[PDB]
Amino acid sequence: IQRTPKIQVYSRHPAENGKSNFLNCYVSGFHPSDIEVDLLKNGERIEKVEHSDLSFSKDWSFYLLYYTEFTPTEKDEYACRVNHVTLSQPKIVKWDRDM
Amino acid sequence: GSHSMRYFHTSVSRPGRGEPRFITVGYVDDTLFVRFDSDAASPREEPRAPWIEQEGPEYWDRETQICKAKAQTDREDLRTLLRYYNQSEAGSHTLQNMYGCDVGPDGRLLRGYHQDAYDGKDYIALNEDLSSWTAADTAAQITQRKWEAARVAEQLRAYLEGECVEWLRRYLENGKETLQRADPPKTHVTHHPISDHEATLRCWALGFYPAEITLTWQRDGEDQTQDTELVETRPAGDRTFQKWAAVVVPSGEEQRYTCHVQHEGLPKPLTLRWEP
Amino acid sequence: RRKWRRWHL
């Protein structure tokens, strides 16, 4: 069984420029559990990102939350980069404060 | 109301890279409360919710020993599964198990669970009777025969009907401030122009607990199920959850659309509209 | 609290 991850990138609170927040990347629905997730600021990997402990849904597929403190601004761009055996190349999902 | 307790376990083999990694977590309802990771230095089961921290050292010692025993059983079981499926020792494989109980508002057992999966597929499950087994294939039938001979179902039934329910009730009392509190969603509607002809209305539900929620859009009182983009409910990272539902609407018709929100924490279901 | 697993596949 191989299942590709669903990915959502979003903030803990509604974004306000200049206000501290948390940037989240939630990966779910995947199998096997080996996965690589980076959070990016203007294309560069953010250091010391934390993540939840591996758990799974009723259908056995896995989910993980990756997160870091961040202070959004007008011009800084954030994204999540995910690699998994189901992917021919890493998937980059950009953060959109309206989603 | 009704409540659940679950323990989830995953072992992942990694040939040539030491013994399998073993991670287990425990939940009450949608609240994580304990975790164990074999790759920690001198691993112990650790608290993840405030109301479990009061358990004494004997509790943590016993839980930690159970987790270490489970990791060891899984290592052996992973080797057995290579035999049962005629697989080589070269690949990484996954063994998962979940068990636990649901209780009703009076605290009595509603249902017990114990089920195992190999490489992401059902392997063997205890049936709802807590007395018979469903094996997914002829390999799991070998396990079924062994577990019938060893009366495993009877051992699980005794736990699920007894300690599982009794300890769940203890946790619900000790954690009543949070486990018995539903936080309603904070809701609002945003408007996102697509063109001069159409815009997206997005209905947000934020900060709610537990995760169960219903969000729907209506136009003139008729459901827009086929036209609604509904994202998967997602964790905020602070115990609470988020969800949104979106519809594309013709410009100027926004007031025909209503978002409807149902959640246990709401005094009554909400109807919301875009408010410029 | 957890249950001891006392059986093998």
Side-chain angles (χ1 to χ4, degrees):
Chain A
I1 277 304
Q2 304 208 328
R3 298 182 188 265
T4 204
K6 299 177 253 113
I7 308 166
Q8 298 191 65
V9 194
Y10 56 101
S11 54
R12 176 179 302 174
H13 302 290
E16 298 188 21
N17 293 335
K19 303 288 169 52
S20 189
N21 204 328
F22 282 84
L23 176 66
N24 292 333
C25 182
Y26 180 58
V27 290
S28 63
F30 58 98
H31 221 288
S33 61
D34 324 273
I35 193 165
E36 189 172 289
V37 182
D38 296 311
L39 298 178
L40 307 180
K41 174 181 185 185
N42 302 315
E44 295 186 330
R45 189 194 179 201
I46 298 168
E47 297 187 354
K48 299 201 147 298
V49 171
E50 296 171 63
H51 58 79
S52 61
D53 292 317
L54 189 65
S55 193
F56 54 86
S57 300
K58 178 189 172 203
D59 69 1
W60 306 109
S61 67
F62 295 103
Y63 62 87
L64 290 166
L65 179 64
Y66 287 75
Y67 58 97
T68 188
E69 186 272 342
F70 83 134
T71 296
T73 59
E74 182 183 14
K75 289 200 176 185
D76 286 317
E77 299 186 2
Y78 291 89
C80 182
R81 180 170 55 206
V82 177
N83 208 5
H84 188 256
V85 66
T86 57
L87 299 174
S88 67
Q89 63 181 13
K91 190 171 295 183
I92 298 173
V93 180
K94 301 178 173 177
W95 178 57
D96 180 340
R97 67 178 67 211
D98 292 330
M99 299 177 89
Chain B
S2 299
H3 297 279
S4 59
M5 186 164 70
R6 294 291 189 272
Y7 291 103
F8 299 97
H9 314 75
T10 306
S11 286
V12 183
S13 64
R14 44 183 171 195
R17 303 189 294 113
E19 293 305 314
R21 187 160 185 184
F22 173 71
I23 300 167
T24 174
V25 292
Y27 283 81
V28 171
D29 303 323
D30 298 325
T31 299
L32 172 76
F33 75 106
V34 288
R35 62 88 79 165
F36 177 101
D37 185 342
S38 69
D39 284 6
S42 61
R44 303 270 304 166
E45 182 168 86
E46 299 176 5
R48 289 294 186 271
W51 45 264
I52 200 71
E53 296 178 10
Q54 64 187 277
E55 301 298 345
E58 73 159 327
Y59 178 98
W60 299 106
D61 287 348
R62 186 184 185 271
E63 288 282 296
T64 296
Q65 195 177 331
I66 291 172
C67 286
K68 289 178 182 181
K70 172 61 164 132
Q72 190 238 257
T73 301
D74 277 10
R75 296 205 284 276
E76 184 166 334
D77 286 343
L78 282 160
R79 294 191 278 268
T80 297
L81 291 156
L82 296 178
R83 302 200 304 274
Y84 286 4
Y85 292 109
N86 307 301
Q87 288 167 334
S88 80
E89 295 181 334
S92 173
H93 298 271
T94 305
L95 181 57
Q96 289 162 275
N97 163 268
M98 99 81 149
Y99 67 84
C101 49
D102 297 344
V103 298
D106 57 351
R108 310 187 316 103
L109 179 69
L110 290 177
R111 178 157 180 169
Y113 305 84
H114 181 281
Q115 49 212 51
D116 291 299
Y118 183 54
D119 289 332
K121 298 180 291 298
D122 285 347
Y123 182 79
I124 196 174
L126 183 61
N127 292 327
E128 189 173 3
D129 57 14
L130 314 184
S131 66
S132 63
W133 300 97
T134 295
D137 59 30
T138 55
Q141 287 168 19
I142 303 303
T143 297
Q144 179 173 344
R145 294 165 197 173
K146 294 208 286 185
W147 288 7
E148 286 165 343
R151 290 209 190 259
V152 170
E154 286 85 348
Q155 298 173 59
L156 285 169
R157 177 184 166 187
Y159 167 80
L160 292 170
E161 292 191 313
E163 281 195 16
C164 192
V165 163
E166 296 157 9
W167 284 82
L168 173 53
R169 296 193 77 185
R170 175 199 183 100
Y171 301 150
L172 291 167
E173 173 63 18
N174 291 346
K176 64 187 172 195
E177 173 186 295
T178 51
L179 297 174
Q180 301 188 54
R181 188 186 79 235
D183 297 319
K186 297 162 224 180
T187 56
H188 73 288
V189 173
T190 57
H191 182 268
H192 310 279
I194 297 158
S195 67
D196 292 317
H197 304 89
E198 299 181 308
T200 299
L201 294 179
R202 180 164 292 114
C203 186
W204 296 83
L206 299 172
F208 57 92
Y209 178 92
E212 171 64 23
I213 194 168
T214 306
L215 279 183
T216 59
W217 275 105
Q218 291 176 22
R219 179 183 70 190
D220 299 333
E222 309 170 25
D223 296 296
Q224 299 293 91
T225 310
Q226 213 49 243
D227 284 13
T228 299
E229 182 185 6
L230 189 65
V231 297
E232 180 180 28
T233 301
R234 64 200 192 185
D238 58 7
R239 115 172 185 118
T240 74
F241 297 90
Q242 308 183 344
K243 199 183 191 61
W244 57 252
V247 286
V248 174
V249 308
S251 299
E253 293 198 348
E254 289 89 355
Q255 295 308 299
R256 297 177 67 184
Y257 290 81
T258 50
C259 175
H260 299 263
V261 187
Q262 297 171 247
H263 188 274
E264 169 186 3
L266 287 169
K268 24 72 187 177
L270 295 176
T271 299
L272 316 78
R273 281 185 175 79
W274 181 51
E275 298 174 9
Chain C
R1 79 177 192 175
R2 293 170 183 272
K3 174 198 58 54
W4 291 94
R5 185 165 183 126
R6 310 194 196 275
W7 44 86
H8 280 108
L9 299 184

